Amino acid sequence: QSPYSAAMAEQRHQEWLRFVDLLKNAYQNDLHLPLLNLMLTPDEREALGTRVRIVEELLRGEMSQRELKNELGAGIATITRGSNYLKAAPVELRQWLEEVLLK
């Protein structure tokens, strides 16, 4: 069926929340590392590691475009998307990220 429907949106939402609770329980049982190895490909794990550094440097604000590109391998489009995500983040998350990533 069509993925663009309320019913499919609700199904995706429930499946996503199930994964979030599964990983929560994995953390609670010290199984987070093998679970994330199973559920994410190596390139996806590498990308997540890089996106942490992109968010950190965007929040810091000291590197420019070409600096971020040459240091992290992230082109301008990727950086702009990350900046859009950061702009859309709730204030509590952004302030916590400033705290934990920059201090």
Ligand X SMILES: O=C(O)Cc1c[nH]c2ccccc12
Largest Cα separation within the chain, whole Å, is 48
**Nearest residue (CB) to ligand X, 11 versus 80:** 80
Question: Which residues in 46-60 are b (16+ Cβ under 10 Å) and which e?
Answer: eeeeebeebbebbee
- Site map for ligand X, 6-45, x if CB under 6 A? ---------------------------------x-x----
**Burial state string for 69-84 with b = 16 or more CB within 10 A and e = fewer than 16:** eeebebeeebbeebee
**Smallest distance, Å, CB 27 to ligand X?**
18
Q: Which of 5, 7, 10, 22 binds a second copy (CB under 8 A)?
A: 22
Contact 9, 1 (CB under 8 A): no
Query: What does the binding site for a second copy look like in residue numbers (CB under 8 A)?
Result: 12, 14-16, 18-20, 22, 24-27, 29, 31-40, 44-46, 48-53, 55, 85-86, 89-90, 92-93, 96-97, 100-101
